[PDB]
Design a binder for this molecule. Structure first.
Ligand SMILES: *[C@@H]1O[C@H](CO)[C@@H](O[C@@H]2O[C@H](CO)[C@@H](O[C@@H]3O[C@H](CO)[C@@H](O)[C@H](O)[C@@H]3O)[C@H](O)[C@H]2NC(C)=O)[C@H](O)[C@H]1NC(C)=O
Lengths: 121, 58, 176
Protein backbone atom coordinates (compact mmCIF):
# COMPACT_ATOMS: atom_id res chain seq x y z
CA UNK A 1 0.00 0.00 0.00
CA UNK A 2 1.15 3.54 -0.83
CA UNK A 3 1.14 5.96 2.12
CA UNK A 4 2.02 9.64 2.52
CA UNK A 5 2.78 10.27 6.18
CA UNK A 6 2.74 13.92 7.23
CA UNK A 7 4.67 15.51 10.09
CA UNK A 8 4.85 18.98 11.60
CA UNK A 9 3.51 21.20 14.32
CA UNK A 10 -0.07 22.29 14.84
CA UNK A 11 0.15 25.27 17.22
CA UNK A 12 2.10 28.49 16.71
CA UNK A 13 1.77 31.99 18.15
CA UNK A 14 5.64 32.51 13.59
CA UNK A 15 7.37 29.94 11.37
CA UNK A 16 6.62 26.27 10.72
CA UNK A 17 7.71 23.37 8.51
CA UNK A 18 5.37 20.59 7.36
CA UNK A 19 7.14 17.51 6.01
CA UNK A 20 5.71 14.61 4.01
CA UNK A 21 7.40 11.23 3.63
CA UNK A 22 6.16 8.90 0.89
CA UNK A 23 6.31 5.12 1.19
CA UNK A 24 5.20 2.27 -1.03
CA UNK A 25 6.18 3.85 -4.35
CA UNK A 26 8.92 6.05 -5.82
CA UNK A 27 7.60 9.51 -6.74
CA UNK A 28 10.62 10.76 -8.70
CA UNK A 29 8.55 11.36 -11.86
CA UNK A 30 5.38 12.53 -10.07
CA UNK A 31 4.36 16.07 -9.16
CA UNK A 32 4.30 16.42 -5.37
CA UNK A 33 1.97 19.13 -4.08
CA UNK A 34 0.39 20.61 -0.97
CA UNK A 35 -3.28 21.51 -0.58
CA UNK A 36 -5.09 23.43 2.16
CA UNK A 37 -8.63 22.91 3.46
CA UNK A 38 -10.15 25.49 5.78
CA UNK A 39 -13.48 24.86 7.54
CA UNK A 40 -16.35 24.98 5.05
CA UNK A 41 -15.12 22.21 2.71
CA UNK A 42 -13.02 23.94 0.04
CA UNK A 43 -9.65 22.51 -0.99
CA UNK A 44 -7.07 25.13 -1.99
CA UNK A 45 -3.90 24.55 -3.99
CA UNK A 46 -0.80 25.87 -2.22
CA UNK A 47 2.38 24.67 -3.92
CA UNK A 48 3.74 21.95 -6.18
CA UNK A 49 7.09 20.68 -7.44
CA UNK A 50 7.69 18.56 -10.54
CA UNK A 51 10.55 16.29 -11.63
CA UNK A 52 12.39 19.37 -12.94
CA UNK A 53 12.47 21.06 -9.50
CA UNK A 54 10.07 23.70 -10.88
CA UNK A 55 7.97 25.31 -8.15
CA UNK A 56 4.37 26.33 -8.83
CA UNK A 57 2.51 28.35 -6.19
CA UNK A 58 -0.96 29.64 -5.52
CA UNK A 59 -1.56 33.37 -5.65
CA UNK A 60 -2.73 33.50 -2.03
CA UNK A 61 0.58 32.08 -0.72
CA UNK A 62 3.04 33.32 -3.34
CA UNK A 63 6.37 34.38 -1.86
CA UNK A 64 5.37 33.18 1.63
CA UNK A 65 5.41 29.36 1.52
CA UNK A 66 8.35 27.49 -0.01
CA UNK A 67 8.10 23.94 -1.39
CA UNK A 68 11.12 21.65 -1.67
CA UNK A 69 11.69 17.96 -2.42
CA UNK A 70 14.19 15.32 -1.33
CA UNK A 71 14.20 12.90 -4.25
CA UNK A 72 16.66 10.54 -2.54
CA UNK A 73 14.41 10.32 0.53
CA UNK A 74 11.25 10.57 -1.64
CA UNK A 75 9.78 13.35 0.50
CA UNK A 76 8.34 16.84 0.04
CA UNK A 77 8.62 19.70 2.55
CA UNK A 78 6.64 22.93 2.86
CA UNK A 79 8.19 25.80 4.82
CA UNK A 80 5.53 28.23 6.08
CA UNK A 81 6.68 31.74 7.03
CA UNK A 82 4.52 34.68 8.02
CA UNK A 83 1.55 32.77 9.42
CA UNK A 84 -1.68 34.67 10.08
CA UNK A 85 -4.85 33.52 11.90
CA UNK A 86 -6.73 32.81 8.66
CA UNK A 87 -4.11 30.18 7.73
CA UNK A 88 -5.62 27.82 10.32
CA UNK A 89 -6.59 24.77 8.27
CA UNK A 90 -5.83 21.13 7.48
CA UNK A 91 -2.87 20.68 5.13
CA UNK A 92 -2.82 17.68 2.77
CA UNK A 93 0.19 16.18 1.00
CA UNK A 94 -0.60 14.91 -2.50
CA UNK A 95 1.22 13.20 -5.35
CA UNK A 96 0.38 12.14 -8.89
CA UNK A 97 1.08 13.11 -12.47
CA UNK A 98 -0.81 16.26 -13.31
CA UNK A 99 -3.32 15.39 -16.04
CA UNK A 100 -5.79 18.19 -16.86
CA UNK A 101 -4.51 19.69 -13.60
CA UNK A 102 -1.42 20.74 -11.61
CA UNK A 103 -3.84 23.08 -9.76
CA UNK A 104 -6.84 20.72 -9.33
CA UNK A 105 -7.19 18.07 -6.64
CA UNK A 106 -8.70 15.61 -9.13
CA UNK A 107 -5.34 15.17 -10.91
CA UNK A 108 -3.66 13.63 -7.83
CA UNK A 109 -4.20 9.93 -7.13
CA UNK A 110 -2.35 9.88 -3.78
CA UNK A 111 -3.20 11.86 -0.65
CA UNK A 112 -1.96 12.07 2.92
CA UNK A 113 -3.88 11.84 6.17
CA UNK A 114 -3.48 15.59 6.69
CA UNK A 115 -2.11 17.85 9.41
CA UNK A 116 -4.13 20.37 11.41
CA UNK A 117 -2.41 23.75 11.83
CA UNK A 118 -3.82 26.46 14.09
CA UNK A 119 -2.67 30.04 14.69
CA UNK A 120 -3.71 32.13 17.71
CA UNK A 121 -3.30 35.88 18.22
CA UNK B 1 9.76 43.79 -24.27
CA UNK B 2 10.85 47.42 -23.87
CA UNK B 3 14.20 49.06 -24.65
CA UNK B 4 14.42 52.82 -24.15
CA UNK B 5 17.82 52.88 -25.87
CA UNK B 6 16.05 52.10 -29.17
CA UNK B 7 13.53 54.95 -28.93
CA UNK B 8 13.13 56.93 -32.13
CA UNK B 9 10.90 59.49 -33.82
CA UNK B 10 9.90 59.68 -37.47
CA UNK B 11 7.07 59.55 -40.01
CA UNK B 12 6.52 55.85 -39.29
CA UNK B 13 5.16 54.12 -36.20
CA UNK B 14 6.85 50.70 -36.59
CA UNK B 15 10.34 49.83 -37.85
CA UNK B 16 11.07 46.39 -39.27
CA UNK B 17 14.68 45.33 -38.67
CA UNK B 18 16.54 43.00 -41.00
CA UNK B 19 18.29 40.00 -39.48
CA UNK B 20 21.75 41.60 -39.58
CA UNK B 21 20.55 44.51 -37.44
CA UNK B 22 18.29 42.25 -35.36
CA UNK B 23 21.39 40.28 -34.39
CA UNK B 24 23.14 43.54 -33.39
CA UNK B 25 20.88 44.32 -30.39
CA UNK B 26 19.89 42.62 -27.14
CA UNK B 27 17.15 39.99 -27.27
CA UNK B 28 16.06 37.57 -24.52
CA UNK B 29 18.14 34.39 -24.33
CA UNK B 30 15.07 32.20 -24.04
CA UNK B 31 15.68 28.45 -24.10
CA UNK B 32 13.50 25.39 -23.58
CA UNK B 33 14.29 23.57 -20.34
CA UNK B 34 13.07 20.15 -21.52
CA UNK B 35 14.23 20.57 -25.13
CA UNK B 36 16.33 17.77 -26.63
CA UNK B 37 17.03 19.21 -30.09
CA UNK B 38 15.42 22.27 -31.66
CA UNK B 39 15.59 23.92 -35.07
CA UNK B 40 15.02 27.61 -35.86
CA UNK B 41 13.75 27.61 -39.47
CA UNK B 42 16.08 29.40 -41.95
CA UNK B 43 14.42 28.38 -45.23
CA UNK B 44 14.74 31.02 -47.96
CA UNK B 45 15.48 33.52 -45.20
CA UNK B 46 15.91 33.37 -41.42
CA UNK B 47 12.29 32.85 -40.27
CA UNK B 48 12.51 35.65 -37.65
CA UNK B 49 11.02 39.18 -37.48
CA UNK B 50 11.86 42.16 -35.27
CA UNK B 51 9.68 45.27 -34.98
CA UNK B 52 10.49 48.40 -32.97
CA UNK B 53 7.78 50.88 -32.02
CA UNK B 54 8.46 54.59 -31.61
CA UNK B 55 7.97 54.21 -27.84
CA UNK B 56 10.79 51.63 -27.78
CA UNK B 57 8.67 48.47 -27.59
CA UNK B 58 10.32 45.51 -29.32
CA UNK C 1 23.41 51.55 -16.56
CA UNK C 2 25.88 53.86 -18.30
CA UNK C 3 28.54 53.45 -15.59
CA UNK C 4 28.23 49.70 -16.13
CA UNK C 5 28.80 50.33 -19.84
CA UNK C 6 32.09 52.17 -19.35
CA UNK C 7 33.06 49.57 -16.73
CA UNK C 8 32.55 46.73 -19.21
CA UNK C 9 34.38 48.73 -21.88
CA UNK C 10 37.31 49.18 -19.48
CA UNK C 11 37.39 45.46 -18.69
CA UNK C 12 37.19 44.28 -22.30
CA UNK C 13 39.51 46.98 -23.64
CA UNK C 14 43.14 45.89 -23.54
CA UNK C 15 42.18 42.26 -22.91
CA UNK C 16 44.34 39.55 -24.52
CA UNK C 17 42.33 36.38 -25.09
CA UNK C 18 45.54 34.52 -25.95
CA UNK C 19 46.93 34.69 -22.38
CA UNK C 20 45.40 32.75 -19.51
CA UNK C 21 44.79 34.32 -16.08
CA UNK C 22 48.04 34.35 -14.09
CA UNK C 23 49.91 33.56 -17.28
CA UNK C 24 53.34 33.85 -15.67
CA UNK C 25 52.04 32.98 -12.21
CA UNK C 26 50.75 29.84 -10.49
CA UNK C 27 48.13 27.71 -12.28
CA UNK C 28 44.55 28.90 -12.52
CA UNK C 29 42.18 26.69 -10.53
CA UNK C 30 39.00 25.88 -12.47
CA UNK C 31 36.09 24.66 -10.38
CA UNK C 32 33.44 22.61 -12.16
CA UNK C 33 29.74 21.93 -11.60
CA UNK C 34 27.28 19.73 -13.50
CA UNK C 35 23.49 19.61 -13.33
CA UNK C 36 22.21 16.47 -15.05
CA UNK C 37 19.07 17.39 -17.00
CA UNK C 38 18.53 13.92 -18.47
CA UNK C 39 20.17 10.64 -19.46
CA UNK C 40 18.28 9.33 -22.46
CA UNK C 41 19.73 6.65 -24.78
CA UNK C 42 21.62 3.99 -22.83
CA UNK C 43 22.46 1.86 -25.86
CA UNK C 44 23.94 -1.63 -25.56
CA UNK C 45 24.37 -1.83 -29.35
CA UNK C 46 26.51 1.30 -29.66
CA UNK C 47 28.26 1.03 -26.25
CA UNK C 48 27.39 4.61 -25.31
CA UNK C 49 24.93 6.74 -23.35
CA UNK C 50 23.43 10.15 -24.14
CA UNK C 51 23.49 12.79 -21.42
CA UNK C 52 22.21 16.38 -21.24
CA UNK C 53 23.82 18.69 -18.69
CA UNK C 54 24.29 22.24 -17.52
CA UNK C 55 28.09 22.41 -17.29
CA UNK C 56 29.50 25.35 -15.30
CA UNK C 57 33.14 26.40 -14.95
CA UNK C 58 34.36 28.88 -12.32
CA UNK C 59 37.73 30.62 -12.38
CA UNK C 60 39.27 33.80 -11.00
CA UNK C 61 40.60 36.31 -13.54
CA UNK C 62 41.99 39.48 -11.96
CA UNK C 63 41.84 41.30 -15.31
CA UNK C 64 38.03 41.16 -15.23
CA UNK C 65 37.69 42.38 -11.63
CA UNK C 66 35.71 45.60 -11.18
CA UNK C 67 34.56 47.85 -8.34
CA UNK C 68 31.76 50.29 -7.61
CA UNK C 69 29.01 48.02 -9.00
CA UNK C 70 27.59 45.79 -6.20
CA UNK C 71 25.90 43.25 -8.47
CA UNK C 72 26.95 40.20 -10.51
CA UNK C 73 27.26 41.22 -14.16
CA UNK C 74 25.44 38.64 -16.28
CA UNK C 75 26.56 39.54 -19.80
CA UNK C 76 25.25 38.55 -23.21
CA UNK C 77 26.55 35.14 -24.22
CA UNK C 78 28.50 36.42 -27.24
CA UNK C 79 31.08 37.99 -24.89
CA UNK C 80 32.28 34.42 -24.28
CA UNK C 81 34.03 34.79 -27.65
CA UNK C 82 35.97 37.77 -26.23
CA UNK C 83 37.10 36.21 -22.93
CA UNK C 84 39.58 33.45 -22.20
CA UNK C 85 37.90 30.15 -21.32
CA UNK C 86 39.50 26.87 -20.21
CA UNK C 87 40.73 24.12 -22.52
CA UNK C 88 38.12 21.67 -21.25
CA UNK C 89 36.98 18.70 -23.32
CA UNK C 90 35.28 15.36 -22.70
CA UNK C 91 37.74 12.57 -23.46
CA UNK C 92 35.21 9.78 -24.04
CA UNK C 93 32.61 11.76 -26.01
CA UNK C 94 31.50 10.69 -29.49
CA UNK C 95 29.02 13.43 -30.46
CA UNK C 96 28.39 16.63 -28.49
CA UNK C 97 26.78 19.99 -29.18
CA UNK C 98 25.59 23.13 -27.43
CA UNK C 99 21.85 23.62 -27.67
CA UNK C 100 21.26 26.61 -29.93
CA UNK C 101 17.60 27.65 -29.67
CA UNK C 102 16.51 30.40 -29.29
CA UNK C 103 20.18 31.40 -28.95
CA UNK C 104 23.37 29.57 -28.04
CA UNK C 105 22.67 28.39 -24.49
CA UNK C 106 25.77 29.99 -23.00
CA UNK C 107 26.09 32.11 -19.87
CA UNK C 108 28.92 34.48 -18.89
CA UNK C 109 28.70 35.98 -15.40
CA UNK C 110 31.39 38.26 -13.99
CA UNK C 111 31.72 38.99 -10.27
CA UNK C 112 33.34 42.07 -8.68
CA UNK C 113 36.24 40.01 -7.29
CA UNK C 114 37.16 38.86 -10.82
CA UNK C 115 35.46 35.46 -10.70
CA UNK C 116 34.11 34.29 -14.06
CA UNK C 117 31.28 31.77 -14.41
CA UNK C 118 30.96 30.10 -17.82
CA UNK C 119 27.89 27.87 -18.25
CA UNK C 120 26.99 25.67 -21.23
CA UNK C 121 23.98 23.46 -21.98
CA UNK C 122 25.58 20.38 -23.54
CA UNK C 123 24.02 17.18 -24.88
CA UNK C 124 26.76 14.60 -25.40
CA UNK C 125 26.92 10.94 -26.32
CA UNK C 126 29.69 9.29 -24.30
CA UNK C 127 31.24 5.87 -24.75
CA UNK C 128 30.42 3.35 -22.02
CA UNK C 129 32.04 -0.03 -22.64
CA UNK C 130 29.58 -2.57 -21.23
CA UNK C 131 30.39 -6.13 -20.12
CA UNK C 132 27.02 -7.71 -20.94
CA UNK C 133 28.04 -11.31 -20.20
CA UNK C 134 25.65 -11.34 -17.21
CA UNK C 135 22.91 -9.65 -19.23
CA UNK C 136 20.11 -8.97 -18.14
CA UNK C 137 21.46 -9.55 -14.60
CA UNK C 138 24.24 -7.02 -15.20
CA UNK C 139 25.60 -3.83 -13.64
CA UNK C 140 27.39 -1.23 -15.78
CA UNK C 141 29.87 1.53 -14.94
CA UNK C 142 29.38 4.52 -17.26
CA UNK C 143 31.85 7.38 -16.88
CA UNK C 144 32.30 10.93 -18.14
CA UNK C 145 35.95 12.01 -18.25
CA UNK C 146 36.82 15.72 -18.31
CA UNK C 147 40.33 16.81 -19.28
CA UNK C 148 42.38 19.79 -20.43
CA UNK C 149 43.52 19.49 -24.03
CA UNK C 150 46.64 21.67 -24.01
CA UNK C 151 47.48 22.48 -20.39
CA UNK C 152 49.27 20.60 -17.62
CA UNK C 153 48.87 20.84 -13.85
CA UNK C 154 51.49 23.61 -13.69
CA UNK C 155 49.17 25.76 -15.87
CA UNK C 156 45.60 24.70 -15.00
CA UNK C 157 44.05 22.69 -12.16
CA UNK C 158 40.57 21.16 -12.02
CA UNK C 159 38.44 20.51 -8.95
CA UNK C 160 34.82 19.68 -8.19
CA UNK C 161 33.16 22.84 -6.90
CA UNK C 162 31.24 22.04 -3.74
CA UNK C 163 32.89 18.67 -3.16
CA UNK C 164 30.57 15.71 -3.66
CA UNK C 165 27.69 18.18 -4.20
CA UNK C 166 29.29 19.34 -7.46
CA UNK C 167 27.13 17.03 -9.60
CA UNK C 168 23.38 17.36 -9.02
CA UNK C 169 20.21 16.02 -10.60
CA UNK C 170 21.32 12.37 -10.54
CA UNK C 171 18.77 11.66 -7.81
CA UNK C 172 16.02 12.88 -10.17
CA UNK C 173 17.14 10.61 -13.04
CA UNK C 174 15.19 7.46 -13.90
CA UNK C 175 15.73 5.17 -16.89
CA UNK C 176 13.27 2.66 -18.40
C1 LIG D 1 26.53 37.64 -6.57
O1 LIG D 1 27.19 36.39 -6.57
C2 LIG D 1 27.51 35.90 -5.25
C3 LIG D 1 28.24 34.60 -5.46
O2 LIG D 1 27.41 33.66 -6.12
C4 LIG D 1 26.22 35.73 -4.45
O3 LIG D 1 26.56 35.29 -3.14
C5 LIG D 1 26.02 34.06 -2.76
O4 LIG D 1 24.73 34.19 -2.18
C6 LIG D 1 24.14 32.92 -1.80
C7 LIG D 1 22.77 33.23 -1.25
O5 LIG D 1 22.86 33.94 -0.02
C8 LIG D 1 25.05 32.21 -0.80
O6 LIG D 1 24.50 30.93 -0.49
C9 LIG D 1 24.04 30.79 0.81
O7 LIG D 1 25.08 31.12 1.74
C10 LIG D 1 24.70 31.00 3.12
C11 LIG D 1 25.91 31.40 3.93
O8 LIG D 1 25.62 31.40 5.33
C12 LIG D 1 24.24 29.58 3.41
O9 LIG D 1 23.78 29.50 4.75
C13 LIG D 1 23.11 29.20 2.46
O10 LIG D 1 22.73 27.84 2.68
C14 LIG D 1 23.56 29.38 1.03
O11 LIG D 1 24.60 28.46 0.69
C15 LIG D 1 26.44 32.04 -1.40
O12 LIG D 1 27.32 31.42 -0.48
C16 LIG D 1 26.99 33.39 -1.80
N1 LIG D 1 28.30 33.26 -2.40
C17 LIG D 1 29.35 33.98 -2.02
C18 LIG D 1 29.11 34.97 -0.92
O13 LIG D 1 30.46 33.85 -2.54
C19 LIG D 1 25.49 37.06 -4.39
O14 LIG D 1 24.26 36.92 -3.68
C20 LIG D 1 25.21 37.54 -5.80
N2 LIG D 1 24.50 38.81 -5.87
C21 LIG D 1 24.91 39.96 -5.34
C22 LIG D 1 23.95 41.11 -5.47
O15 LIG D 1 26.00 40.09 -4.79
Amino acid sequence: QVQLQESGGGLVQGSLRVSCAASGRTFTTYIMAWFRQAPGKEREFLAAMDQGRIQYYGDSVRGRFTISRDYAKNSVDLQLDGLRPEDTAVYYCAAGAGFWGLRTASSYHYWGQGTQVTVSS
Amino acid sequence: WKDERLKFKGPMTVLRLNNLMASKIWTPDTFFHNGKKSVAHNMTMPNKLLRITEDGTL
Amino acid sequence: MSFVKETVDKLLKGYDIRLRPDFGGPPVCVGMNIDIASIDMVSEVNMDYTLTMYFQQYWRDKRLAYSGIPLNLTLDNRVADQLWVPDTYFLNDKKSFVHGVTVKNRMIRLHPDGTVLYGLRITTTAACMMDLRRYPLDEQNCTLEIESYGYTTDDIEFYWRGGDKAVTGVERIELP
